[PDB]
């Protein structure tokens, strides 16, 4: 009867809803976009409500627009943006401040303090993280101390805190459930990760009442029922990345994928052990083959697809993301030009909040095409940057990188990437790899599936990009690239 | 009978022809553009022929489109781009290599050698120059050594060398005259400036045959006749700048002007005595009130209006030089962006053949308008850069700056300029200040005029810019600027 499953995707710039068949075919897609709030420079916010509305809209049209009824889909899977924080009035069921995006940089001050007070190591050690406005730890704080009663209510279990997922479930289940998963948990910077639980150190250090925290659960488990009707399950939950990692079926030690979207995230699975990055990465929680904790090596890159948007929206050198390849190919080379996409500081191995974007190597004969290209190239540089650490830590030579993400369509890109990595690059047949995950996770969590090895057929690499550039050629390039970076670091006067 | 005088101006990006009456009015102007060759990044050449050619026509036009006849003009004045080197077959009358433009950085290697043979002082001392690809000595060489028999023929007077002027005159006078004036001579880096003659040291050091050199003469004298006819005369030569200094009538100690065009040349008259820079400036030859030798302190800025061209032709952020003002005033500020126009290295006071162009402090809210603005701004910075050296060296506080050049039409610029300086800026009434120059010289040379007080009434300042920014603001900006610069130097790998 119940022939399908639903993947709910709460993205950085929109909400999506996806439907699959048993053969995991994409039956249908829905998707509204929602407003980006830059209260001020470096600041990003969302309307927890807007976020919500969308996502629901999504949910339904899917439904209708394909003419499926609540009576035919197993469960629901769920994926979302990862650091972005929410806090709301419970009773009221209203947010007491707009969602603060992972993107947002307001929590810098704080970050600085912490730094002082010799905590890096507790953090790195117990959170697998690092000090940076990225993670919600400080986000949360920022709110607390910015709102009045706040800490009281909070303390008196009055105020609720969530992560996209968290916040979603709440609504699904009308206030009934206040849970989250591990992956997602991880991300907060208030969660011991070999302990699988909140961490008082932080909790108090950050000064947060355990009262508003939510039940941290497994990624592939049943969390509740949604009477979207005809009560529907919620059995899936991951960070879009882990999500996608899962969907790429990197579901066991040394498997990795690089994702090319608004940003860049390359996760590598560390199986059951959590490995410590000595080279500027993140230690984080993933999914093992059942929705079960696993560990992962993570490189996060703030600007990727976004620079492209920049290009199109603020410089207006292009009209389409699409356009970029045509122009890039319009020239033979970057003409010596280098573009450092540190619009938001650096991160990745760098983690330099004072970096600022920069263009280098200008010469009279350089033109917009050259600038465009350079831009794309930067994306690859970045990706190599981390690849290298990954290997550093990992102690593993990937011979093939499996990618995914919106921009994995830019073939130029794709091939440039292979060329500079000196590695083979695999472009999967399907692309909604993320949803994939949450949908798996979900129905795996419902015995809609009794294995990975069923959906293992969805994993069909469509395109293999082999390197075609000379090793020299290769390092040549990379050199200047770093030359650049150095020059862009520490711009911001602190 | 003969009522007019013609100025011939061979510039970095275009040839020009200008006509004037006795009251020194601009009867008419002709003007054809010529291609800029960037054989390779940091390299710039011209087609001596295309020079020629385009310089040839303007003449005509100007004539013919005002219906003047060869019979009504006295002489002909000559101003040209100052360092650009040409070498050509004589019998044959053809270049044996494209013009190497002053901008061109190909001769840095060489330059490096010279540096390590401890010749800076001799240079500095006898030339008033500095070791840098700017000046021709090395250009010449570069050619020699890059062409086959070259030094023989050269050696057997087979080959001929000259600067633009030298090259024009040659053409003018079908092969009749091979001279140049001092100004222009100075610039070669092969002429002692206290001896007023070639200098063997140099000559041999660089291994140039005294054979292809040209008679060095006075700026205002009768060199020959042009049968453009109806034999017309040539009684005037000057490097463009020198020429505009005269036109500005800065004709005695402490008179300075800053010119704004393809580049930025700020000169200041040092009378009969040659002052020695200690602050990265140039000691060179100028015109005394009678077209007699004088000395000057010179600051050379490679990129200026040129970065605007860039914006418009390569980046295409605008359709008109014009447009720049509008867009810039479209924003309140450069939003932290800093642009370092080092497309052809740095130059005064820096003299960094390895610096390359750079954009800085990018941030996602940055737009094309900010870029635009930044660029202009960078022009004023640079200017400040030198102005202080100027004083550093001069030991003189200018209380006003007299400018001129294409770009002084840019009021925003102009204003911004006076703000960052902390000084009033004077925009004279007449703008063909250069042609003015050449004409005078040329005509002054022929009893077409018999005193610089005559023409003296043209110096009417039309607009005066006074600073509207606070002293702080001022240094605050400058600071970033310098910060910016630092980061752009030594890009190029040597
Ligand atoms: N073709 C091409 N080329 C290049 N580039 C490109 C393209 N397309 C697109 N692109 C890009 O991509 C991106 C998008 O894609 P994606 O969705 O996948 O990502 P995400 O992260 O998910 C965001 As959400 O989370 O906020 O939604 C963006 O950023 C753009 O820009
Ligand atoms: N408005 C405005 N704004 C800005 N800018 C401008 C304008 N107009 C113009 N401009 C500019 O300026 C310049 C012109 O002016 P001049 O003619 O004087 O220059 P030379 O010296 O001649 C070089 As050639 O000799 O090579 O031509 C050029 O470069 C442009 O860009
Ligand atoms: Mg000129």
From Swiss-Prot, chains A, B:
Changing residue 474 to D: It decreases Vmax to about 10% of the wild-type value and the affinity for substrate is increased about two- to fourfold. This mutation decreases the catalytic activity in a manner that is analogous to that obtained upon EIIA-Glc binding. HAMAP family: Glycerol_kin. Beta-D-fructose 1,6-bisphosphate binds at residue 231. Homotetramer and homodimer (in equilibrium). Heterodimer with EIIA-Glc (crr). Binds 1 zinc ion per glycerol kinase EIIA-Glc dimer. The zinc ion is important for dimerization. Sn-glycerol 3-phosphate binds at residues 12, 82-83, 134, 240. Its EC number is 2.7.1.30. Optimum pH is 9.8. Pathway: Polyol metabolism; glycerol degradation via glycerol kinase pathway; sn-glycerol 3-phosphate from glycerol: step 1/1. Keywords: Allosteric enzyme, ATP-binding, Glycerol metabolism, Kinase, Metal-binding, Nucleotide-binding, Transferase, Zinc. ADP binds at residues 12, 16, 262, 305, 406, 410. This is Glycerol kinase. One of its GO terms (biological process) is glycerol catabolic process. Key enzyme in the regulation of glycerol uptake and metabolism. Catalyzes the phosphorylation of glycerol to yield sn-glycerol 3-phosphate. It also catalyzes the phosphorylation of dihydroxyacetone, L-glyceraldehyde and D-glyceraldehyde. It uses only ATP. The gene is glpK. Pfam families: FGGY_C, FGGY_N. It comes from the Bacteria. Activity of this regulatory enzyme is affected by several metabolites. The non-competitive allosteric inhibition by fructose 1,6-bisphosphate (FBP) causes alterations in the quaternary structure of the enzyme. FBP inhibition requires that the enzyme exists only in a tetrameric state. Salt such as KCl reduces the affinity of the tetrameric form of the enzyme for FBP. Unphosphorylated phosphocarrier protein EIIA-Glc (III-Glc), an integral component of the bacterial phosphotransferase (PTS) system, also inhibits non-competitively and allosterically the activity. Zn(2+) binds at residue 473.
């Amino acid at each position: 009867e119940k022939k399908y499953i639903v993947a709910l995707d709460q993205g950085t710039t929109s909400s999506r809803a996806v439907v699959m068949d048993h053969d995991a075919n994409i039956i249908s897609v829905s998707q509204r976009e929602f407003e980006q709030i830059y209260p001020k420079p470096g600041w990003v916010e969302h309307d927890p409500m807007e976020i919500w509305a969308t996502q629901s809209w999504t949910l339904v049209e899917v439904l209708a627009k394909a003419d499926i009824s609540s009576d035919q889909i197993a469960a629901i899977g769920i994926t979302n943006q990862r650091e972005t924080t929410i806090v709301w009035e419970k009773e009221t069921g209203k947010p007491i401040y707009n969602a603060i995006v992972w993107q947002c940089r307001r929590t810098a001050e704080i970050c600085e303090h912490l730094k002082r007070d010799g905590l890096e190591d507790y953090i790195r050690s117990n959170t697998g993280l690092v000090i940076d406005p990225y993670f919600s730890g400080t986000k949360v704080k920022w709110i607390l101390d910015h709102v009045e009663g706040s800490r009281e209510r909070a303390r008196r279990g009055e105020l609720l805190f969530g992560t996209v997922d968290t916040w979603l479930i709440w609504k699904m289940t009308q206030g009934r459930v206040h849970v989250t998963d591990y992956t997602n948990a991880s991300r907060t910077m208030l969660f011991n990760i070999h302990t699988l639980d909140w961490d008082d150190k932080m909790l108090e250090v950050l000064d947060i009442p355990r009262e508003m925290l939510p039940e941290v659960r497994r990624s592939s488990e049943v969390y509740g029922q949604t009477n979207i009707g005809t009560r529907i399950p919620i059995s899936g939950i991951a960070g879009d990345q882990q999500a996608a990692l899962f969907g790429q079926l990197c579901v066991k030690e040394g498997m990795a994928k690089n994702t090319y979207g608004t940003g860049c995230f390359m996760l590598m699975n560390t199986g059951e052990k959590a490995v410590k990055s000595e080279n500027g990465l993140l230690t984080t929680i993933a999914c093992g083959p059942t929705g079960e904790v696993n560990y992962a090596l993570e490189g996060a890159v703030f600007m990727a697809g976004a620079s492209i948007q920049w290009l199109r929206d603020e410089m207006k050198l292009i009209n389409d993301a699409y356009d970029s390849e045509y122009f890039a190919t319009k020239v033979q080379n970057t003409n010596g030009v280098y573009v450092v996409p540190a619009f938001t500081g650096l991160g990745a191995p760098y983690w330099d909040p004072y970096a600022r974007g920069a263009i280098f190597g200008l010469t009279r004969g350089v033109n917009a095409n050259h600038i465009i290209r350079a831009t794309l190239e930067s994306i690859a540089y970045q990706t190599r940057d981390v690849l290298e650490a990954m290997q550093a830590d990992s102690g593993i030579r990937l011979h093939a990188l499996r990618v995914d993400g919106g921009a994995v369509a830019n073939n130029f890109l794709m091939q440039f990437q292979s060329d500079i990595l000196g590695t083979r690059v695999e472009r999967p047949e399907v692309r909604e790899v993320t949803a994939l995950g949450a949908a798996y996770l979900a129905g795996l969590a419902v015995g809609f599936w009794q294995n990975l090895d069923e959906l293992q057929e969805k994993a069909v690499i469509e395109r293999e990009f082999r390197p075609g550039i000379e090793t020299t050629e290769r390092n040549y390039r990379y050199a200047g690239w770093k030359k650049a970076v150095k020059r862009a670091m520490a711009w911001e006067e602190h």
